[PDB]
């Protein structure tokens, strides 16, 4: 009834309606949406035909509606298209019929996919010109349909009205313009964006992505403000420090126009001499110029070398603090924590070791807090649209031999359904995934046969279960749920591998039997959650994954044809020695890998190579665009998955010691000893034997510490009950520590020192700091929080252990003994060509001069135990470079590697990261969030990481943030004071002050290392004007008030910053006429960022976000008290174990474990899980030709080798322990951010 064929009388009626016409359309009637069944199913004769409009909102105007077989509402234009085409024209009727046809949409979709394939081919064949013409013809043909059906721009719903249709018009007009330097074809890849327009599902997701980034202006402004403020701090502190180089010593010849000579050569001038790169000193191992510093903490050049400022720069010239432009980039990289340890070591080496305080604040105030603030908002923004989407569903519902065969069929059915049969199958699955885990590199004939024989017996059992199941219930009913389907495909996949094994030279399908371990999800709940996370990404979140896949492909082909030509021609400017670059862009597969590497968080490493090849300006835009856009989609996908898927004497003495134990003076006495005993541990450096008076003093102190603590335990034992002491977990912790100390002391006095087990027990003195946990309530409440999560953490670790067991066994099968390289020690650690040494047999054949060592990668796939460490390094993105490089080079069993031979081994590492590092991490954070949410509810809706006293202060300080607008200040009746009051209280005065802050902020970015005296004087004069006017505006605003400086707390911040600026601006003039400050002048110069910090008053969004950090300050302090204690404990472990190790990649002469100061620097670097692979490598190696045992050492030890056993345990546990504590910090801000919203 409602639907009818369009008629001219109906058009005239709509005209009359518009006539007397000269407040919201219905959601259910919007375009590209399904029509409700209330109006009725359109007849087959009316589908694809013009029908009158249904919504009264558009009834006034000339609009009409069509529907397809799928009943999608389409609103076209009824006004004359192109001024000649009436809506009733037969050609227009044919055009609109083909526009709504679902077959037409599939035609465009298939064409785009074919075009996307043809755009990924570098150096296309010359016959593709017709294909480009055909794609141009098709795209113009479908574009002409829109013009022939809707108009061009004139009437409401038209072609160039929806923003997405501009893309099609731009593509066709640009394609024809090209048909009417060759790098301008990069615009043709925009045809891949048309996929989003074709699929209606993808369009809404893109709209959701824009909304997510729209709710980020306050955070993005704060992020830019924080980075710019920190850049000015870094600029004024390390201005030109990175240019320090160990220039060779020289002497100046007398006369001869000031010529300078080297040891044997002569240079014309000092400028020419020093700028030469052949007289510097390269760092050991790497090809890096060794930085230095005149400070007492920075590095030192060896004999014959001196520290001089002049030089080019580190990292080809792109890593410097000389200008604000470089300072911003060098600190945005710190914000992302992409290779930040390289800048961490370079700045400490050049400036000094004390400057790690600056890196601590940048990593916290700029990286840890700000990135988490970004992630907190995206989760908040998604929760807002998720609620609305669910709300739109709620309102929709409110409105609305045969008898023998049968006899044996039921008999086997009885056996199959029996629960013991299923349990044995699960037990068989567990054994099968464990028997085949007994795979290593150096096998034997018997072991390989036993493992091979075990394959058929396990495969044969599964076939019998499948054979019995297909006949038991029903052949058709057997398929049913996918659990039965999944078993069928896997069991027949193994049979294909076994049948192929007769000719199976390349057998890898046997590694797919591990997928049967997923059958354990029936009983395991956590395994089910992991499957649901993966299923949601391909299921309900299919569109979001498709958008990410589409975006990654586009950025892969954008860079392939933009930098592909330059990479091939200028490969020598980025080649290691003489070969191709490892990460180039001349091929699509390598182009995609760089995009994937950028998504993983490593961008600047490949940015330097591209900037040195193609162009600095262009490479900066593309690499940063994929960094912002790529992470925005990935973070949206990661957060979407997480939220969607989730006698009287005895009595008398007992009372006396009870009183003394409970006395407060006793409690602080023990705390004093706990801190002192922990402090003396760090004193045992490698120079202890040199200091004769400190080694005996520490030994006496150790005796006193173990005598006081024993007395304390005895007093508690006598006073408190035996059950009371042993029922307290904290008291048990102290009991073990003292027991270890007592055993070591009693063994030393017994004359049984320096033995095997006793000497290992002395190292366990590093657990002495653990006694401080039970005393400070700030740390005890944090420990109480992580103890409650131990059952939840253990469940996730088992699932990740099973998930990583599949990849480790599969990785062992793919690579086992293929990581061996026959290196030549005379040259260096460089694999040789196969034209000389082909395998291990040939390497030993030429082993006549004793210089060919068949070494192997320290972290490799030789067995499941060794494979677990490699997966950990790959998943953590630390040290994975040396794994993929040695894996995409494998050339068979015990064969010499070749450049990119077996190149597609990169796919194995990419898939693992998507599954074992992305989805696995998503499961862990989801469980931890769920667990700690339960603890908050269990505790009574109170913060978990906060003490009782801190709660009072935080609650009291929370009320301080209440906005209570006070009454206006009375006008002073001094005429002149009243006049200045009127011109000051006006808000326009604050705008002028705010404008002056930006000008002062701008004039500090002009600072550069190459500062001429004329530029210095002009800037000094400009600063003098700024400090004068600011004092003037402070002296007139205060003059009007004169009695209420206490109120408006921002009015005291500017008063002290002006006084500080007044002190600074007069000391600088004094300093020029007084003793020159070597480094104190930098501080007073740098103390001017207070003016920049005055912008908080005028920014509401910035102030609110900063208020959340102040809320989370007491919570973060408690968590950080524990992390530093753990870092302190591990540092003492490092000095006792990893001292006197060979200096190598991660262990320089300044970042070793010899001293507490040096070990503290290393552990802070590993706290962010950065560069832990580089530090682990010098411990893993043992024996020649890498290490050299039987080497004399000062502290009794011998040999500079490493300990692979404890070296792996030390770094693996600390990486995990730090991550849990860091995660505790990530959510503490989020909960505070959610509450403050
Ligand atoms: C090719 O041919 C060479 C020479 O025959 C082989 O090199 C030897 O390989 C064996 C193992 O197969 C090594 O034996 C090991 O020796 C350890 C004791 O240390 C020995 O060398 C120490 C000297 O230091 C060496 O390394 C440093 C660098 O760290 C160099 O600067 C030195 O020049 C030395 O090369 C000394 O203490 C002393 O010489 C020791 O003998 C021992 O702890 C191990 O258990 C093992 O027995 C041997 O050291 C290697 N070199 C020597 C001296 O012969 C090479 O393996 C062959 N490669 C193949 C596979 O073809
Ligand atoms: C490379 C190659 C591996 C390829 C594996 C292909 C598996 C296909 C499974 C299949 O048919 O889909 C389903 C699995 O259904 C399951 O529940 C099995 C889950 C198994 C998860 C395995 C993850 C492996 C990760 C490995 C990572 C490395 C079964 O089909 P269904 O979806 O049940 O079909 C009906 C659906 N409705 C109609 C009921 C909705
Ligand atoms: C969404 C959209 C995102 C868009 C993001 C970024 C795009 C916009 C910014 C970059 C535009 C191009 C700039 C350019 O080419 O400059 C160059 C100089 O470059 C420098 O001097 C270094 C600049 C480093 C980067 C600055 C910090 C960015 C931190 C991140 C952003 C800020 C932090 C917050 C992020 C939220 C130009 O040099 P040139 O000499 O003029 O030309 C040389 C050309 N040849 C000779 C080589 C051919
Ligand atoms: C690596 C392994 C790490 C394992 C880490 C954490 C696992 C801790 C498990 C604790 C289980 C017992 C819980 C209990 O009763 O008391 C808990 C505290 O427990 C603790 O504080 C344990 C501290 C352990 C510190 C590391 C020791 C190993 C170092 C190895 C170094 C090498 C609860 O607090 P409480 O105040 O006792 O509750 C009293 C409740 N009533 C009686 C009042 C109702
Ligand atoms: C019992 C373990 C024995 C053991 O393996 O001893 C050592 C552990 O060595 C390590 O590196 C492990 C360090 C573990 C730190 C745990 C912190 C817990 C924090 C909990 C925080 C809770 C709250 C959150 C290994 O043996 P060793 O003693 O090195 O053997 C002698 C070696 N030399 C000296 C001969 C070379
Ligand atoms: C809360 C709890 C937190 C902590 C939880 C527990 C964490 C870790 C517990 C680790 C316990 C064992 C530590 C030492 C093991 C060791 O040295 O073995 C080595 C080999 O085996 C390995 O390399 C070990 C690999 C597995 C451990 C690292 C990856 C963990 C991934 C976790 C993923 C978690 C996902 C979630 C020994 O090598 P070697 O025999 O010296 O070599 C030959 C030496 N000779 C003979 C040539 C001289
Ligand atoms: O020539 C070809 C010889 C086989 C080889 C090396 C080639 C390409 C992809 C390689 C596969 C990637 C897959 O990636 C894996 C791991 C990750 C999962 C997608 C499962 O498949 C390997 C088993 C699979 C793989 C390593 C099996 C061997 C394949 C080149
Ligand atoms: C964050 C994540 O990815 C990145 O690092 C990353 C960096 C830049 C851009 C994008 C991503 C991690 C890499 C691996 C990891 O490494 C430790 C340090 N990181 C910070 C934490 C992660 C995640 C952790 O849950 C953990 O992953 C596990 O699979 C499960 C539990 C885990 C503790 C186990 C051991 C190491 C893990 C194994
Ligand atoms: C730098 C940063 O590291 C990370 O946690 C981190 C996490 C993820 C990625 C990268 C890095 C820190 C986060 C919190 C911290 O504790 C953790 C350990 N680090 C080394 C030191 C920081 C910073 C410190 O200034 C400190 O922050 C405070 O808020 C103020 C002073 C502080 C000493 C107090 C106690 C602990 C702090 C509390
Ligand atoms: C940069 C590349 C350029 C060629 C510009 C010109 C037209 C632009 C497009 C114009 C409109 C849109 C729609 C916009 O999303 C929406 O407006 C939501 C959907 C809707 O409009 O209902 C997302 C960006 C996008 C694709 C723009 C992407 C960048 C484009 C292709
Ligand atoms: C994630 C979605 C929105 C896709 C984003 C794609 C853009 C990052 C690409 C698409 C087209 C590209 C442009 C295509 C062509 C050129 C011309 C090029 O200059 C030339 O004249 C060619 C090179 C030369 O000869 O020097 C500079 C880069 C630029 C603007 C490219 C910049 C990067 C663009 C905008
Ligand atoms: C969960 C526990 C698994 C992670 C464990 C249980 C059994 C372990 C396996 C037991 C025995 C071996 C043989 C072992 O073979 C060797 O070459 C080691 C030295 C030797 O031969 O004695 C390599 C590790 C491996 C596969 C182990 C790897 C780790 C496994 C699978
Ligand atoms: C995405 C849309 C815009 C943000 C893009 C499209 C075209 C881009 C421009 C394309 C080419 C260049 C040249 C590029 O190199 C230079 O300007 C070099 C100057 C020199 O060498 O002297 C700097 C970035 C810029 C302006 C790009 C800036 C960003 C633009 C305007
Ligand atoms: C009963 C359940 C709770 C046991 C859980 C054990 C797991 C925590 C796994 C994870 C990693 C495993 C380790 C991985 C590798 C090895 C090396 C393995 O020794 C070798 O085969 C040498 C390998 C080499 O160095 O080449 C001995 C077992 C061990 C310590 C494994 C012991 C069991 C571990 C700790
Ligand atoms: C290992 O590397 C060296 C080069 O560092 C190869 O060349 C030898 O180098 C030494 C020292 O310069 C010369 O004295 C020899 O005459 C060189 N031998 C030659 C010509 O090969 C050395 O050959 C390599 N080791 C091998 C392959 O035995």
Numbering used by the authors: 11 to 32, 53 to 210, 216 to 435, 700 to 945, 1190 to 1780
What does the paper say about this structure?
Voltage-gated sodium channels (NaVs) initiate action potentials in nerve and muscle. In all of these structures, the central PM is composed of an extracellular vestibule, a narrow ion selectivity filter, a central cavity, and an activation gate formed by the intracellular ends of the pore-lining S6 segments. The poison dart toxin batrachotoxin is exceptional for its high potency and toxicity, and for its multifaceted modification of the function of voltage-gated sodium channels.
A total of 86,763 particles were selected for refinement and 3D reconstruction, which yielded the final map at 3.3 Å overall resolution according to the Gold Standard Fourier Shell Correlation (FSC) criterion of 0.143. Therefore, our rNaV1.5/BTX-B structure is most likely captured in an inactivated state with the VS activated and the pore closed. Two equally strong (~10σ peak) density components with a shape similar in size and form to BTX-B were observed simultaneously in the central cavity of the PM at the level of the fenestrations, where the local resolution of the map is ~3.0 Å. We designate these two BTX-B receptor sites as Site IIB1 for the site in the DI/DIV interface and Site IIB2 for the site in the DIII/DIV interface, reflecting their functional roles as BTX-binding motifs in Neurotoxin Receptor Site II. Remarkably, K1421, which is part of the conserved DEKA locus in the DIII P-loop that forms the selectivity filter for sodium ions, interacts with the carbonyl oxygen of the benzoate moiety of BTX-B through an unexpected water-mediated hydrogen-bonding interaction (yellow). The binding of BTX-B causes local induced-fit conformational changes in the rotamer of some key amino acid side chains. Notably, F399 and F403 from DI-S6, and F1667 from DIV-S5 adopt a “down” rotamer that allows for the binding of BTX-B in Site IIB1 (blue: Supplementary Fig. 6b). The binding of BTX-B to both Site IIB1 and Site IIB2 appears to stabilize the π-helix conformation of the DI-S6 and DIII-S6 segments, and the α-helical conformation in DII-S6 and DIV-S6 segments near the flexible gating hinge GGGS locus. Our analysis revealed that both BTX-B sites are compatible with the open state channel and require only changes in the backbone of flexible gating hinge regions and in the rotamers of a few side chains in the open state to avoid clashes.
